Design a protein that fits this description.
Chain C: It comes from Homo sapiens. Chain C: Its main location: mitochondrion. The structure is cut from a larger assembly and holds nine protein chains of nine kinds. Chain B is α/β, with parallel strands linked by helices. Chain B is 27% helix and 11% strand. Chain D contains three helices and four strands; from the N terminus they run βααβββα. Classes of the chains: A little secondary structure, B alpha/beta, C alpha+beta, D alpha+beta, E mainly alpha, F mainly alpha, G mainly alpha, H alpha/beta, I alpha+beta. Chains in contact: A-B, A-I, B-E, B-H, C-E, C-H, D-F, E-F, E-G, E-H, F-G, F-I. The site of one magnesium ion has 4 residues of chain B, from loops. Chain B binds four RNA strands through β1, α1 and α4.
Amino acid sequence: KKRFTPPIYQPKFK
Amino acid sequence: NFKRISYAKTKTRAEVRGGGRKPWPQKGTGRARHGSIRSPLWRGGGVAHGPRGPTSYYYMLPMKVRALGLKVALTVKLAQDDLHIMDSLELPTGDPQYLTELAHYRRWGDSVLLVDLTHEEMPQSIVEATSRLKTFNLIPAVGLNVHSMLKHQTLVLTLPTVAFLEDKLLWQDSRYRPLYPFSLPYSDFP
Amino acid sequence: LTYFSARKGKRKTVKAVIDRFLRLHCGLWVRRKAGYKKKLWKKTPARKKRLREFVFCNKTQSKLLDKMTTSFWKRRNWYVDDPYQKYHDRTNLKV
Amino acid sequence: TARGTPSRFLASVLHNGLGRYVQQLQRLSFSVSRDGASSRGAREFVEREVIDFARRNPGVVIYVNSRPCCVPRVVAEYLNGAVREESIHCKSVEEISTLVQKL
Amino acid sequence: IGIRLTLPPPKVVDRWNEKRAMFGVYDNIGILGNFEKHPKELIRGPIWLRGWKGNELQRCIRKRKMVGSRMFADDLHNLNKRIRYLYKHFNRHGKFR
Amino acid sequence: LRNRVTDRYFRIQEVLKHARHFRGRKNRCYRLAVRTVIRAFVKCTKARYLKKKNMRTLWINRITAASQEHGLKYPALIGNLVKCQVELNRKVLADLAIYEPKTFKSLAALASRRRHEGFAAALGDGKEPEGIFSRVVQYH
Amino acid sequence: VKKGFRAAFRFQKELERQRLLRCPPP
Amino acid sequence: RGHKGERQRGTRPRLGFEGGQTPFYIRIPKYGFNEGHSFRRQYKPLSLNRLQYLIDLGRVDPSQPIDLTQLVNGRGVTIQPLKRDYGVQLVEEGADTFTAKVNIEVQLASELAIAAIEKNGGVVTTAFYDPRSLDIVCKPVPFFLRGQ
Amino acid sequence: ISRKWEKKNKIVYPPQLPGEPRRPAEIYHCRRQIKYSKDKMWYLAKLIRGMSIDQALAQLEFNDKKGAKIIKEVLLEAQDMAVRDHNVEFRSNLYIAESTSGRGQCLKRIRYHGRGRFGIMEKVYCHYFVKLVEGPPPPPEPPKTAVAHAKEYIQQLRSRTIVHTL
RNA sequence: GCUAAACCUAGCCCCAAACCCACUCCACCUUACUACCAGACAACCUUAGCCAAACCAUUUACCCAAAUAAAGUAUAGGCGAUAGAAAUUGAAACCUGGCGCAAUAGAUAUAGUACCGCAAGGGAAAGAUGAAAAAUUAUAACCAAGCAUAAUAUAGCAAGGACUAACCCCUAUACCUUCUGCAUAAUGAAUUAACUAGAAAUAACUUUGCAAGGAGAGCCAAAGCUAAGACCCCCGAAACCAGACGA
RNA sequence: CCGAGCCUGGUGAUAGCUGGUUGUCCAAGAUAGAAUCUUAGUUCAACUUUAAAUUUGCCCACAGAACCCUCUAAAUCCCCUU
RNA sequence: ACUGAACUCCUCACACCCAAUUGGACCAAUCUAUCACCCUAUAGAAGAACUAAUGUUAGUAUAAGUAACAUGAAAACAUUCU
RNA sequence: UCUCUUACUUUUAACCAGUGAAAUUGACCUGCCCGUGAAGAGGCGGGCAUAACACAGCAAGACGAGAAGACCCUAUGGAGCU
Ligand SMILES: [Mg+2]
Ligand SMILES: [Mg+2]
Ligand SMILES: [Mg+2]
Ligand SMILES: [Mg+2]
Ligand SMILES: [Mg+2]
Ligand SMILES: [Mg+2]
Ligand SMILES: [Mg+2]
Ligand SMILES: [Mg+2]
Ligand SMILES: [Mg+2]
Ligand SMILES: [Mg+2]
Ligand SMILES: [Mg+2]
Ligand SMILES: [Mg+2]
Ligand SMILES: [Mg+2]
Ligand SMILES: [Mg+2]
Ligand SMILES: [Mg+2]
Ligand SMILES: [Mg+2]
Ligand SMILES: [Mg+2]
Ligand SMILES: [Mg+2]
Ligand SMILES: [Mg+2]
Ligand SMILES: [Mg+2]
Ligand SMILES: [Mg+2]
Ligand SMILES: [Mg+2]
Ligand SMILES: [Mg+2]
Ligand SMILES: [Mg+2]
Ligand SMILES: [Mg+2]
Ligand SMILES: [Mg+2]
Ligand SMILES: [Mg+2]
Ligand SMILES: [Mg+2]
Ligand SMILES: [Mg+2]
Ligand SMILES: [Mg+2]
Ligand SMILES: [Mg+2]
Ligand SMILES: [Mg+2]
Ligand SMILES: [Mg+2]
Ligand SMILES: [Mg+2]
Ligand SMILES: [Mg+2]
Ligand SMILES: [Mg+2]
Ligand SMILES: [Mg+2]
Ligand SMILES: [Mg+2]
Ligand SMILES: [Mg+2]
Ligand SMILES: [Mg+2]
Ligand SMILES: [Mg+2]
């Protein structure tokens, strides 16, 4: 199929 | 070890508040393979192999072995000149200063275990003398063990106290089988 | 065989071992050869007699049957009319 | 390895074999504790064999500080000025005797 | 670097305090005490172990049987989960079988 | 944490004290310093036979050069020295050839004379003289 | 914090040794 | 732990599984070996030799009638109230060299034992008791402390 | 955070004897928290190194960089504190002996790429160290001619002796 | 010497005891944080599922009445992996701690804060001088990974043997693993600091004690019984049900 | 990120499948096979690990081990001496 | 003829080079009892050791000062021009 | 579009001023030929080759970077359809 992974955003504290 | 209750308890990877869904896909991203957080390999998880609940180290030795150990401790205290038999534990005025001066003059050591009998039949002078010191202790004839004897350097007993100890230690020899606990009235045993 | 139960925390036994075997106090298990009651018309009388004999087990089999049981099945019973009473004790044993 | 530690040459301090042989060892400062279970060997040594070790060679002076410590040590100074300090922590009398003889 | 620079303060402990100097008192009262009370009754602590050792799972079973009828909800759930895990680890996984 | 590690830096220093003269990150990275020190110690232990063989070959080369400068060869010299009941290893021969040329020239002359006597005895199948400097000494 | 005293004592002795080695007294 | 696989991962079958193969304790048919063992009547043995030994030592006085409580007090036999025990039987192993002359109450006494007891001048009494009576006669002190 | 460079100007020396040299002065000064890169500061320090203070100021006045004026002001205030407090009379009898650069405290920001990913923007900071010594500047090391190489080769060929024997 | 390293207290887990609380005035069931108007309808229900039996369709402690022996006994069970009582002697009121820890440990918590979605929900690091900061002083420095101080100088898994001196002379194919055979061009790795992975029964071995009896009721016994020591990992999937949420 | 969604609980689900499994020394220590909806696993043979009881373990020699038409080799099995 | 190993010999005493596995001896940070307080021993317990698991967290190098990148011009700073 | 490409402008390209990545890294003092090896060697044997250090372009190799291959096979691990 159409394999795709969504990106993950880090918390805004670093 | 028979009076040890370790209250240490650490949570595992299941009792920790957290970890439910799956952080990031395993096949999608190129990060490490993980299924849930709060793991012993992550930061803030539970202990893998640690103390789980209160652990009790309860175990009892045979009565004959304990009686033989008491007799061996008595023999060790008697052979090394660390056993002074008395007739009546009484003091003229009852004070810690006179007590420690007599102990230093009679060459006993830095500690001595004073043992009486029946607990209730103890004079007030020696009680008030020992209630102000730390090395001097007053325990009855029943509360005598092995750790308190080995902790002190010498031992002090009395004629009725030593007679009670002798008969209680010889009662273990030439007896019948337990069958039922000795708390019953029996017939010959009081 | 459930080494630790959920109520008593003890060790459980297998009732099949008790219903199919019989342990003696010496450390031997008495079993029965299979097929001693089925298809007896095509077997020679010698085979029929051989199948109807109390055959003992081996070493690994006895160890397995002992591990599958607890300390209750390894005691000594004193029945009134026990036909296997003479087989409990084993005399004339030289290593 | 040899490429990580310094080296020297084999020579005498002041030609002892030519003229006369002298004792290189001078002082032996022992530190034996008063109470403890880590200086029993040193205590027994000072009790039984230190007199014989002092009378064997008059050119060696033995100092017994008897300082209450935990690790018994020994200081050995030579003519050239080298100071080798070793510890006799939990050692028998024979081991300490062999060590001081080698020193 | 995981080494503390300054030395810690000398933790002095009085070896002749109360429980230290009076340790082992009234121990073994059955032998030389005409047998009135068992020495196991002098142990102070959790009620589900006053004179009983047991294993890791046996202690949890005894706790759920004696005290399990008077605990919390999350604590009881965690105890049940731990008992299930110990059961699955002892009666399914392992060695020497 | 209960009774965890409180003296790990001492082990790191004990490992790194053997890696205080290396080039690159091997003198600082413990993970590589361990392997570097391991290989260094293994090679230092295994190179004893290599050092012995190198010293022996150097002694043989020095003896051969000295024999060629005097006017002989190495195998003939070794044979004549082993056939004259004189046990001298390669080290003393090299030391003499480097420092004491007179005794080495005397040894070369003795070897040449022994070789000539052996050739004469082989061509004559000896009978009577068999070499003046020969005559092995019997030790019972 | 890390509970201990013997390792801390050895580390302090090493620090004193490094101090006396870097700054040699008369 | 050896190499990888079930021997290292810990996921091993239960004790007795031979990997699909029919185990040894299954291919054998059932037989009436332990059909009703929990209901059979068990009796502890008691030889006349040990009885004479107890009488000579003094733990069994031959002046009073001997039953079950006397044997429990003398501690010659161990009568278990459970495990389906209906008393203590009698064994004629100590027939020869047996001089006691004392009445004894045994639940099961053989012919040789009764004869040997009657030779010196003893009385054998065969009686039966329910497990409740066994528990009562074994330890009478807790039965008296009970309150029933 | 450690500060040990600004405290070296307080080391008091005992009074000398009439039979002792003059001993040049040592002036330490540095600034903290400078919005610049450490590589460019080190390049400027390598451009300076051991030269006269006036020549350094002249080279920095015509240096088209951001830290040039910063280093110029640092040298100016250091010379001022030297001639006002460190007991320095001549203003042109100074030379820079040591001049290096360090690294300052850094923060973290975002970069925003062309997708859900991003970068770690680390605010690069640095410092600047300099030391002023009185007296004329020392001349540079002249290159060794063929005579020095010949003498060294002769010494090396004369120092070799017999090896692997006695 | 810059970057940066340690400085204990908010307390955190379980015991024994004790049963613990909920309006100062206003607003809070509609668009909660809204003072004021006409259909009153709204609960009373076998939980399921995973795993195991090498599949799986019967079956699989979880059921909320204090210990133990009986007993893992009779029994139920594709009579098989397993489950499991009852009848019975019995069960001594009152005492304030940690042979647990100190911010990557212990509750996630200074906090259910920021942040993500309309939504249920998920959800993380924080604070170190000091008696006198109303002592803005002069010091206490010294150790990891990254840097200048102090770049390179021919040749070679970075190493060893060595000499008067770094190179120059000789030898020598990184580390753990599925593999007969791996540095192989197979797998993992940039370092430092913290954390992380062998938990346990019947039957066995050794050492005290007693002994035809042992054992603190129950159990075993034709040399036995009690006690102690000794022992059996971690992480990683697609799937199913139940309770709520979205056009 | 729908050939069938997000959250929580069952769940630390299971998985013969992958990887890893922490200080030193010494000694012992290498595999005829059978069964299984099984050869990627498991169980039993054989070998390896400890402390005891018993006495025989190896080449052993004159001799012994039907065959059939056409040949039938190199060898093997029991074997006190040494 | 000679060169030529970890094979043999010279002074020493000899347990100090197999996969999996098994057995025997030491080692250290915590608490507790016993002695010493410039730091160790006798006994009991362990959350008792990391060169590795695309292991979790924080600091920092190579890649790399590499790619991307802003502001129309003059000027009294009141304005003018495309 | 080609034979057969060319004339100019912008983005862009090279240097100066600063913010300043991402993938990736076991360490590199990093040349070639013949031959060998887990079967395609800059680190192994024999030869050839050699003062050191940056900038500006192309891809021949380091079976180079991204996805535990979607193609073939195993799984008493699943799901959809009939
Ligand atoms: Mg959970
Ligand atoms: Mg999972
Ligand atoms: Mg935690
Ligand atoms: Mg593996
Ligand atoms: Mg395998
Ligand atoms: Mg399975
Ligand atoms: Mg089948
Ligand atoms: Mg299943
Ligand atoms: Mg009941
Ligand atoms: Mg925290
Ligand atoms: Mg947290
Ligand atoms: Mg450093
Ligand atoms: Mg070379
Ligand atoms: Mg490893
Ligand atoms: Mg693999
Ligand atoms: Mg292969
Ligand atoms: Mg590789
Ligand atoms: Mg692979
Ligand atoms: Mg890689
Ligand atoms: Mg719409
Ligand atoms: Mg798993
Ligand atoms: Mg398989
Ligand atoms: Mg040789
Ligand atoms: Mg040899
Ligand atoms: Mg071996
Ligand atoms: Mg742990
Ligand atoms: Mg650990
Ligand atoms: Mg580490
Ligand atoms: Mg990667
Ligand atoms: Mg790692
Ligand atoms: Mg580039
Ligand atoms: Mg550009
Ligand atoms: Mg630029
Ligand atoms: Mg190879
Ligand atoms: Mg090639
Ligand atoms: Mg390569
Ligand atoms: Mg794959
Ligand atoms: Mg299969
Ligand atoms: Mg399936
Ligand atoms: Mg299924
Ligand atoms: Mg489905």
